[PDB]
Design a protein around this ligand. Sequence first.
Ligand SMILES: Nc1nc2c(ncn2[C@@H]2O[C@H](COP(=O)(O)OP(=O)(O)O)[C@@H](O)[C@H]2O)c(=O)[nH]1
Ligand SMILES: Nc1nc2c(ncn2[C@@H]2O[C@H](COP(=O)(O)OP(=O)(O)O)[C@@H](O)[C@H]2O)c(=O)[nH]1
Lengths: 264, 369, 370, 302
Amino acid sequence: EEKELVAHLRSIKRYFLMDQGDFFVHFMDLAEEELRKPVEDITPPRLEALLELALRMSTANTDPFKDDLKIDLMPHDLISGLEAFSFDYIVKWPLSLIINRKALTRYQMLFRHMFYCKHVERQLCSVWISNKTFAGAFTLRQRMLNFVQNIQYYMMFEVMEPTWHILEKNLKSASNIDDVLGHHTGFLDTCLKDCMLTLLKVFSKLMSVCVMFTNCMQKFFEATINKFDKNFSAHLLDLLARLSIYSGMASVISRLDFNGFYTE
Amino acid sequence: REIITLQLGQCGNQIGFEFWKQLCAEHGISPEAIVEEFTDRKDVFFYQYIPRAVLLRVIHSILNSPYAKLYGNNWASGFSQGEKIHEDIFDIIDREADGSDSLEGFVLCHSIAGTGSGLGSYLLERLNDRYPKKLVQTYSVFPVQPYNSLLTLKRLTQNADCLVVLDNTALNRIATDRLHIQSFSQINQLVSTIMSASTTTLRYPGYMNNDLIGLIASLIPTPRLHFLMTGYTPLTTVLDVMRRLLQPKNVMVSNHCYIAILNIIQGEVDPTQVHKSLQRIRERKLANFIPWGPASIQVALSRKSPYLRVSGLMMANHTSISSLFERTCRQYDKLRKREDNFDEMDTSREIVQQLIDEYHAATRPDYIS
Amino acid sequence: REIITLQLGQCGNQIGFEFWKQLCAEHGISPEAIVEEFTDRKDVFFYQYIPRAVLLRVIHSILNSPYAKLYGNNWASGFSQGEKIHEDIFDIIDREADGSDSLEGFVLCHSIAGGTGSGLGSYLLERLNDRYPKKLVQTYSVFPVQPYNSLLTLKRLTQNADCLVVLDNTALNRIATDRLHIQSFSQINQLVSTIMSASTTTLRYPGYMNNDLIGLIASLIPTPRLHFLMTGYTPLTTVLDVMRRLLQPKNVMVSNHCYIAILNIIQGEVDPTQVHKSLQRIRERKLANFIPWGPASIQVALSRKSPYLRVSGLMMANHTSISSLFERTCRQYDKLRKREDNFDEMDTSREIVQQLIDEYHAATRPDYIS
Amino acid sequence: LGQGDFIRHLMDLLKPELVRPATTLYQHNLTGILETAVRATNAQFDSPEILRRLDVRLLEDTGWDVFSLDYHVDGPIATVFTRECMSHYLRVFNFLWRAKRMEYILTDIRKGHMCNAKLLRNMPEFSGVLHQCHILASEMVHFIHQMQYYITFEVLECSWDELWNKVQQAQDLDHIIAAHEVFLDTIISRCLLDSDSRALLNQLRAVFDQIIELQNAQDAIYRAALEELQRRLQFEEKKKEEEEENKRIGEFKESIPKMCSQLRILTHFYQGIVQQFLVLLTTDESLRFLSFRLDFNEHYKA
Ligand SMILES: Nc1nc2c(ncn2[C@@H]2O[C@H](COP(=O)(O)OP(=O)(O)O)[C@@H](O)[C@H]2O)c(=O)[nH]1
Ligand SMILES: Nc1nc2c(ncn2[C@@H]2O[C@H](COP(=O)(O)OP(=O)(O)O)[C@@H](O)[C@H]2O)c(=O)[nH]1
């Protein structure tokens, strides 16, 4: 009731899990040119001025706790400039027992993994208009767009959402703080497990050919489009081979292919 | 990113005037353009509140309506007069463009059946000249009539980056079957239900689909196959809604397979049985897709306006839309054998034949090359 | 320091009377020029209460108004008649001037569209530049044989008046049809008086800065030629929203290009700590451009609303686009010069306004100097 | 100086006095001037008690270096100020007095130019060098008219708000002293009057000096054009000889490029002391809000 917690966890979810859409489509649109620059070249006084302006102009203006978002450029990538950006959240004392630096970097580990997948299909969909006024790349763009927009749907409505839906109800029947401290870390270790965050590094290298293919099309050859095909399609088949060999982690295949394609 | 809409002809005005009325009520906005006290993103269509519309004798009917404080029959007559006011109507669109922060699209509402046909053919040509990076979606409505209809299709197949078909014939059936009307003042109520529920994901921000180019690039795989049809069941679980959208009784259309499906569920249904229904739809095989490329079905949830129960809308890219063209193509040749160059009609005739062939080639396991 | 205002012609007299009505309502002063019981520095525009006005048919309308206790169509005819009564009006002007402790300026409210007010204001500006050499002259001129009178007024205003504020009836009528739904003079004059009263807000309510007319003038006008300003009034809530709605072309009373100087006046009770964040974000998003040669910035100041009478705001800009308007007049003059004692004064006027338009067009270049 | 209305009139009356050297200045004369200002401005409608303590004091050159107000306070109220708040206010009042005369100078120059061009607008050979006199002004008044805002909004209106907020809720007179004592440790810090920010203030003084040197090199170029104009008026009004003046008019045109080399070297040194000033701000946090005020539209920093 006082210094409420359930009305405090929702605010973190809007930015960390990127629930709020109006805030990111307007932030990356403003702070893109200033993120492609390399690391140790961008002034944080320039980013934070855009973050503050991104919140107020968006529909996140109705948020009492919005003033606790800080920019934190990580030194290491998800083992520069763009791959070294992640929000940071500062909280007061009494709530710091629940959401602390030990269990906030986890919110910051599954954020960059979603800011990467949101960035690629943001520009992959941007080349969609440039070509529309040499003609065999449209059927390859279909192979990557129907992959990221089939991972994002599984990553947002059938992974974190279900776990979050449980946590909200699982905090109405709490009895003591060392239980809430269990229903929380019991929610972060599940999101990091159902997602590919726990190894499965083939996804990391799989994303390289997607973003790089956007660069080739942005340079406007015919022997290079077909070169990406044999390279990306081979990397995708390595994924479904390892995603299938297990004891959901199996329903993901039904999301990747729906027409019986990739039956090889 | 803002979307400035256009309304041409008696049709475009009437559907747009009733589209805004559906939106003005879905938000807490009085018809006096004043917010009522009574979270929903409203900046895309409204400018801080005024709608971003550029209309073009029905106008007087709007100026007498309580919403006054919110703002021949030849295809050649439409294209000719549109050239005489080239600078007039482009003054308005340009002054409305730069005043906006960052323009995104041009949702254009016009019927291809008098002056809206010839004028809309003129605009879709002129927009691609000056604005080369702006999407142009059109909510065209299907009904000398064969001539004016197909001539717009020449422009709508190479200029408009999207198109949503809504034929009055299939609508009239649903007007007769489940509404028992026998009127324009009634079928437009269904059209306004389709137009408003189409952009429900832009006005209510969710996980994805926070921009118009997100709804477009997912369905339309190639620049040519850019025609979409709609499906709206409520006239109860997610399985109840998903099964009804795929029935041919609900589609607003009078081998064959789908290309991409997007489901809009505006209910408060818990997001846990969303994957179970998709799993079931695959098993019973209620719909088939293209064999060549990987085609998947996507479902999206949203939140109903509290100021105004489960609904559902489906954006479909179906090859069976090629049938509507053939009806236009057929009646043209009959009028071509019944009666300064008359070459534009024949040149338009050729490109429509290229399109229909592309559809019937899309259902082949070797559509590539 | 006391400011004396002058009202010429029908338009000038009407807007001045409505401005005085608004200002008397803002303070506790009854129409009978008696203070009502019910901090606001009122000595600048009022004399201990009587306003410092010099009115020059509608005078009968004012005398029949409840505020009685408060006091041809050619340019050449106006100039001649103003020359005829030089001493008569200047005795009044001089007695009202030397009666004041320390005079500061001469606010002139008149319409340059046509009639006798145009030529009379021309003559008065010339004679005031002659007699008083140390008095600033600001002019709330209102824009509409009309092109002749207008261009002559511009010729006299581009060298004499040390400042000027434009007001076009076309933009006012556009705003009236848009957001007031009028289809009248007595309706657009309301908005005009609102803008005018909000213009001199910082002089009547003392703040940290802007306690004198020079504080408002010398900040904006960088060179003696570029002395034409435009106005914007957004409230028809944070300061960022106000500043974002102000820079929209939808509100500016004006029918490459860049800015020379911007001034914002905020009359609300807003939190004054978010203004620097507002300016930071405005610079970030790059909503407005500045001159490339000299360092030009935007200034913002706050004030207090009249308690006897909510967040409002006004913007005064020095935009190079204003020259466009002159061009139209110029153009029309040429069209009037080829369709029909010496008739050379109009030619000199055309010459000097061409000079001014050329200077404006050269101001937006990275090498405007020299 | 939070009144503005009163300090404006007070700077117009002390102008004829302080220009003289300090040796001819005696305190008993200035009090009549101060009393006159309080009667003229809006400060007359004020509590008579607080007006009994407002007086003058003479610091121990020129009259603009030894004048300052004191507002001495004795009695029970003296346990809040404690002889140290009165030794900090005068340490602040000097910085607000300098940054106030450096502005009323730059609105006097900007007033001269509005009456200057209304006289000598008939000499097309002089506007070439008169122009450099305008640009250097409008480039100099920006640096001052912007620093005035950082003084108002980011030093006074912001640091005073954290004081009136910790007073209407404080109590026991020991949360008031501690709230008023830190209110004098931020203003000394937000202004450049700190101890470790010495290199910054002495750098600002040079910019304060260049404003005076312009005001001295301006009237010299201004008056030299009015003499030649006045002679040119009388050299033709009495007669309406011709060869003995063309050499005087001819040499007058030859002295113009000499004056142009002054304003060309004065400007090129003014920009060299401001572009050096900004580098010193990147040193302790609230100063960053000043770098944006000056560098708006990036007129500097290339
Ligand atoms: N769905 C629908 N279609 C309409 C409506 N009103 C008109 N239409 C269509 O618009 C066509 C007539 O266009 P018309 O008004 O003559 O265009 P105009 O010449 O520009 O005025 C008809 O074929 C109708 O199919 C309406 O209320 N609803
Ligand atoms: N904006 C505005 N302009 C006015 C108003 N009344 C008159 N005018 C302008 O004044 C002009 C007429 O001036 P006029 O009275 O004939 O001048 P006179 O011959 O000296 O009396 C018209 O062109 C109008 O544009 C008013 O109430 N508002």
